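Why this split exists: single-chain examples teach little about how molecules sit against one another. For that reason, every record in the complexes split bundles all components of an assembly together and asks for one structure covering all of them. Below is a record exactly as it appears in the raw files.
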Amino acid sequence: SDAALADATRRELEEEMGRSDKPEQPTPPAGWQVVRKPGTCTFDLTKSFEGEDLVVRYSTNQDSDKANSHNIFVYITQKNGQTMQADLSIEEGELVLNNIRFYDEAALAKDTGAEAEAKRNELYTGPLVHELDYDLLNCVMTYLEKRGVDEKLGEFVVLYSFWAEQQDYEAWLTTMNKFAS
Amino acid sequence: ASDAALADATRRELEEEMGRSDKPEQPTPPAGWQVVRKPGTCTFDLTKSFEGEDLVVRYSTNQDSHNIFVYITQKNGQTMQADLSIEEGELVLNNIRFYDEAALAKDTGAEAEAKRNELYTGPLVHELDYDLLNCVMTYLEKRGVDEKLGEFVVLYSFWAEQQDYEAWLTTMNKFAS
Amino acid sequence: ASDAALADATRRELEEEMGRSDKPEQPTPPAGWQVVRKPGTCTFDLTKSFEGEDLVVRYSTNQDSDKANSHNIFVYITQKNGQTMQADLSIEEGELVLNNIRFYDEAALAKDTGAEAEAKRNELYTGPLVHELDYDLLNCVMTYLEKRGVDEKLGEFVVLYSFWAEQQDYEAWLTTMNKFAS
C-alpha cells in the first residue's frame, strides 16, 4: 500500500540491526529461574527458600506515563497456601516498597484472569505503606533482601526489560513493514 | 524457616495498637439500615426497604494510594445508581444512571463491570438544571441517604480499617515466625 | 411528596428538551463507512473495506467526568490472514493525535469485548512509546492512516455524532427517571 511507510520501517530496521550498542541480555542472579508466561511480556523469576515458593513477576511492557517505571510483584507462599504479595518499583537502582497484602491461597494471588483480579480487588489491600514506621518497614525490606529480592535483582529486571523491549520493537517494526507491503 | 527481626517488629507494633486509648469505636448505623459485609471482603452494604423499594448503600473500607454507591430498586426491577462523595460530612452527587434489573447494577465481578462501562453512564450531574438537581437530592435525603449516613460510612470505615490493620500485623507476625 | 416534585421536574425538562429547535443534528458519516451500534450500548463501530483490509474505527459516546474535551478512537486494520493493527488516537482541536500502535495475531483477540478479552490483551506487547519514535516513521503512519479515511473528517464525524448521541441518551434518561418518580 504505502511505499513511504515501508521505506521508513525498512530503514529503522536497518538502523537497529546495525547498531553496535544494542542492550545486552543480562544474567539472572543466583538461584532464580526465568520463565516467560507463554506468548506474553510477563516473566516469573522463581526459586524455593526454606520451604517457601518465591515468585518475582514483572512485565517488559513500557508505560506511556512514567517511562522510567519498573514495577515488580513478589509472591512468597508457605506450604499451607498463605501468600504474601509485595509491590515494589525500581527507582534509581533501588527497590521501593509500595504495597504489602496477604491471601489465603496462592492461586488467587497469582491468577492473571480478569475475574481473579476482581476477586482480589474486593479484599483488604493492606495499609498505606508510605505511612508505616521505619523499623517495621525496614525489617520487611531486610526480610525480602535475605531472600534475594534486592538491588541486584532490581538491576537484572531493568536490564532484562531494556533487552526484551529492543527485541519486541524489532518484531514490531517487521510486522509494521509487512503491513506497508 | 522464618525471620525473627520481623517477628519482633510486628509484635512490637501489635502491642502499640492494642495499648491505645484513642482508637476508633464501631459506630451504629441510622435506624432501619442493616449493615452486612460480603463474606471475607472489605465491601459493606447498608440495606433496608422503603415504600416497596430495595435500597443499598455500598462502600468499601479500603484506602487508595470516601465514596458510596446508592442502588434503589423498584418492584419491576428498575434500578437507579447514585454515586456520591462524602466531602466534609456532606454529600456531593457525582453520577446518576439506570439499569433494567438490579443484578447488572449490584453484581461485582469483572464481566459485570465491563458491561456497565459500555452502557450510558448518565449526563454530567453538574450541568443539570438546578431545579431537577434539587429534586433528586431531596428524593435521596427522603430515603435516609443524607449527611447523617455519610457520617456513619466515614466513621465505620475508619473502624474496619483499624481491625484489618491489626489482623494484617497478626498475619505478618505469624508469617515471620 | 418529594418524588412527585421530581416527576414534575423531569417532565418539565423533557418538555423543554423535546421542544428545542437548536438541538444537535445527527452527522452524515464520511464516504464508505457504515455506522453500527453495539446493541444496547454507547459503543459504535465505523466499518469499511479498503484494498482487502477490514477497517474498524471504534468509539464511545460516553464522556469522562473530568475529560469532557477529549474523544478517543480505536482504529483496527485486519489483514486477510487475521493479523490486526490497533492504533489509538485522540481527537483534539479537530486534529488527530496518535498515541499507540500495536499488533495482534488474530482479529478476535484485538476486537473482542469483555473483561477477559481486555485482560488477555493487557499481557501482550503493547508496542513502543510513540513519543520516542522518529518523526519520519510516525509521520508515515499518519499518512498511511489518512489514505484509509482515518483523517480529520472522520474525527469531526465522531465528535459530532457523540454530541448528537449524548442528547438522545439524556432524553431517554429523563424519561426513565420520570418513570422512576411516577
